[PDB]
Symmetry: C2
Subunit: 182 residues, 2 copies
């Protein structure tokens, strides 16, 4: 078992037990090792969460760089569709808001939450066609963020359908010289 593989296993545990009940003992039974082994490789649960979020930042950047780039506003629309539809709601999605809140209470994790968000914002900024409004990347990131929490509180249909309806609405406003976003 490699350090990377146990970090992925820990991600499973975090999304299942939440950050409060996240423990080395739980990560061990998941990946199939001992607590003493994890304390040797990661010291404590706080450092394991740090290493997990560090890998998360790299994984965000890797995933955003992988999505093909189409032409113009339509390519931006295509990019946002893939990004949003990637959010898995097969299981309880609300645990991720506890993870977020918890991370912001721990300074080193808060820094990594910042880097995670800046990576997504930068990924969107680099896909902006010419002529897009200033700081358009921030407004688009806010729509995804806000519309997702909207649905998380008051779910109606699929998460992606709720979010992308609003993304299409604001893209139509940003790029009125286009036909339409469907």
């Amino acid at each position: 078992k490699s350090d990377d593989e146990v970090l992925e296993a820990a991600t499973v545990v975090l999304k299942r037990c939440g950050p409060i009940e996240f423990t080395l003992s739980g990560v061990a039974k998941e990946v199939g090792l001992s607590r003493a082994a994890l304390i040797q490789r990661f010291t404590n649960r706080d450092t394991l969460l740090v290493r997990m979020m560090e890998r998360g930042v790299e994984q965000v950047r890797h995933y955003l760089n992988a999505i093909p780039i189409g032409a113009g506003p339509q390519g931006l629309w295509e990019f946002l569709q893939v990004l949003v539809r990637s959010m898995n709601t097969r299981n309880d999605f609300s645990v991720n808001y506890l993870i977020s809140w918890y991370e912001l209470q721990v300074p080193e994790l808060r820094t990594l939450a910042i880097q995670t968000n800046r990576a997504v914002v930068e990924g969107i900024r680099n896909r902006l066609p010419p002529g897009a409004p200033a700081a358009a990347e921030l407004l688009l990131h806010s729509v995804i963020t806000g519309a997702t929490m909207q649905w998380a509180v008051d779910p109606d249909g699929e998460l992606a359908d709720h979010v992308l309806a609003q993304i299409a609405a604001i893209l139509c406003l940003m790029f009125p010289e286009q036909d339409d976003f469907q």
Copy 2:
């Protein structure tokens, strides 16, 4: 000595201070100045007190939104949104809002009230849309406020309201091109 509404107010202080997980009747008792037994006599237990708190919250949101001065056209919308955004006090227990929200989604009786609460904000925004505003504009505007606020909460720079209203002005400018400029005031 201390009315039910006074109890709900003190309980809200405890909730914002301690969060929904460490929230206890003993804490509310200490804050409001009644015995825990008196609170049990009147609210049964901590969970039921939380429900009553969120029921009151739904009415308070609607009354607050209704009371914001009523203006005309896109400018009236812009003015209403400025007041709504500036009402969030980031120096009075703000991060706890996100733990409260998560918690509410775990308790069905509370989640129903969180849904009513968000729907009251969306409808209050809809009630200030001028004729000719895009369909579903209220949901988009609510998402920008909600999303820009969490954006700032994670990665703050400057004041929350300036961060959020910069994006509201930008989207309003796109919603109403005929309009002149959406400036702060």
